[PDB]
Amino acid sequence: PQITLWKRPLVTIKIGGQLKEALLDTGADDTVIEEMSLPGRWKPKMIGGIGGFIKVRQYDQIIIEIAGHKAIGTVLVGPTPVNIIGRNLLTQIGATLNF
Amino acid sequence: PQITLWKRPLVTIKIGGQLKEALLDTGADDTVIEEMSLPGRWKPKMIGGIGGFIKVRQYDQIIIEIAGHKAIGTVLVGPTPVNIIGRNLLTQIGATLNF
Numbered sequence: 001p002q003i004t005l006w007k008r009p010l011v012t013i014k015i016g017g018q019l020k021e022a023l024l025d026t027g028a029d030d031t032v033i034e035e036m037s038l039p040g041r042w043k044p045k046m047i048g049g050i051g052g053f054i055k056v057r058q059y060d061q062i063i064i065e066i067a068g069h070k071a072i073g074t075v076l077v078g079p080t081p082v083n084i085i086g087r088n089l090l091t092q093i094g095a096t097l098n099f
Numbered sequence: 100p101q102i103t104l105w106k107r108p109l110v111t112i113k114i115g116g117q118l119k120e121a122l123l124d125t126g127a128d129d130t131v132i133e134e135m136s137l138p139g140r141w142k143p144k145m146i147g148g149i150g151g152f153i154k155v156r157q158y159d160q161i162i163i164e165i166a167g168h169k170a171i172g173t174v175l176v177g178p179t180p181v182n183i184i185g186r187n188l189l190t191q192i193g194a195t196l197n198f
């Protein structure tokens with residue numbers, strides 16, 4: 001499907017067995033998800049945005065469903081006010097920006 | 100025109116007669132440009148993202164060119180580490196997300 005940008009590009013995702021809303025974000029290098037109880041090994045990482053950096057948990061090889069597309073990759077979990085799907089997973093599902 | 104996301108989606112912009120590089124960011128409501136001198140009336144605003152908030156100058160009705168496309172809209176000027184083209188201008192250049 002094709003998504004115009006008149007509204008935030010929000011989609012349903014599945015992660016750890018749970019349905020969530022997240023923002024398709026071409027301006028993000030990485031995927032960051034709100035604090036949740038996710039199984040898997042992780043390590044601490046700093047990630048940055050406008051306003052500086054936050055401390056997140058980095059989980060590798062996490063299976064995530066994005067608008068019905070499966071993808072496996074790194075997920076960061078931390079105090080974001082919004083779930084965002086970054087380029088590391090957008091590429092996995094074949095997303096592109098067109099105009 | 101189609102842009103894959105294996106790398107940051109950066110393009111050349113012209114603002115205030117100066118050339119700059121900016122990120123096309125479907126996750127950003129607003130367009131934010133690094134500190135520069137811009138003619139025009141403006142008002143203070145604070146905008147928020149991953150590490151929190153920054154103070155910006157809001158300029159309305161700025162003529163800007165993005166990847167060869169003309170647009171006129173609101174531009175926020177402030178201490179962002181990366182120039183960002185948000186949805187307010189991406190809709191004017193007819194960007195869509197495909198996947």
Ligand SMILES: CC(C)(C)NC(=O)[C@@H]1C[C@@H]2CCCC[C@@H]2CN1C[C@@H](O)[C@H](Cc1ccccc1)NC(=O)[C@H](CC(N)=O)NC(=O)c1ccc2ccccc2n1
Pocket residue numbers: 025026027028029030031047048049050080081082084086122124125126127128129130131146147148149179180181183185
């Ligand atoms: C630009 C503004 C209008 C502030 N909007 C936003 O920030 C909204 C805020 C929303 C709510 C909080 C959760 C994030 C979403 C999406 N964003 C946009 C969103 O696209 C935002 C834009 C951006 C890009 C680069 C640098 C700064 C900011 N990207 C990001 O926040 C991602 C997060 C990540 N690490 O994956 N940052 C980066 O990918 C990134 C890249 C280069 C950097 C260089 C120096 C410092 C920081 C850097 N951060």
Ligand SMILES: [Cl-]
Pocket residue numbers: 005006007186187190
């Ligand atoms: Cl809009």
Ligand SMILES: [Cl-]
Pocket residue numbers: 038039040
């Ligand atoms: Cl566990």
Ligand SMILES: [Cl-]
Pocket residue numbers: none
């Ligand atoms: Cl290169």
Ligand SMILES: [Cl-]
Pocket residue numbers: none
């Ligand atoms: Cl000033």
Ligand SMILES: [Cl-]
Pocket residue numbers: 159160
């Ligand atoms: Cl005006």
Ligand SMILES: [Cl-]
Pocket residue numbers: 162
């Ligand atoms: Cl003109």
Ligand code: NA
Pocket residue numbers: 166167
């Ligand atoms: Na041109």
